[PDB]
Amino acid sequence: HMCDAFVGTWKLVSSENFDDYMKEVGVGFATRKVAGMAKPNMIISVNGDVITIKSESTFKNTEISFILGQEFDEVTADDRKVKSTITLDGGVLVHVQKWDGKSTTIKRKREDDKLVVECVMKGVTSTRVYERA
Ligand SMILES: O=C1c2ccc(O)cc2O[C@@H]1C1CCCCC1
């Protein structure tokens, strides 16, 4: 019953500061514009110890599967090749991505009926709110 409150299908309903977050990450202009326009659905499932997170939008469809605490290699939607580790910290899913001596963290947390995503790169934070589909 690891991650029960995260499991399901979630749809983006608001975003703040995402363009600036993507700039900080190094995403180029055209990708920022199309990715920032996206209205992704986040689909989270669990089977045993394996968690799967799918993101589907008109921009890109991606899928990761992982075990908490166990690093994996990821190609991100913006085509970075990163080494990722996802853990549960005090009920928050914490996703750290490392590449080229850089690091960014994506936190997913349940707050009321929402799933709130906080993306942090250095001093720039973007907050994205998802609701159940
Ligand atoms: O993994 C990510 C993620 C997941 C959910 C969300 O709402 C925002 C997110 O931003 C990142 C990256 C997406 C693709 C573009 C670069 C940033």
Side-chain angles (χ1 to χ4, degrees), residues 12 15 18 21-22 25 27 31 35 40 42 55 59 74 76-78 80 95 97 106 108 117 119 126 128-130:
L12 183 71
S15 184
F18 191 57
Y21 168 77
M22 288 190 288
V25 167
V27 183
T31 298
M42 189 189 311
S55 178
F59 168 56
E74 183 179 6
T76 69
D78 63 304
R80 286 171 287 129
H95 179 178
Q97 298 177 328
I106 305 145
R108 293 168 171 91
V117 179
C119 303
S126 171
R128 290 169 57 97
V129 177
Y130 290 73

Side-chain angles (χ1 to χ4, degrees), residues 44-60:
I44 303 176
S45 59
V46 179
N47 181 326
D49 294 338
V50 182
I51 304 165
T52 299
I53 303 176
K54 296 180 181 191
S55 178
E56 301 184 338
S57 76
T58 58
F59 168 56
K60 209 73 61 168

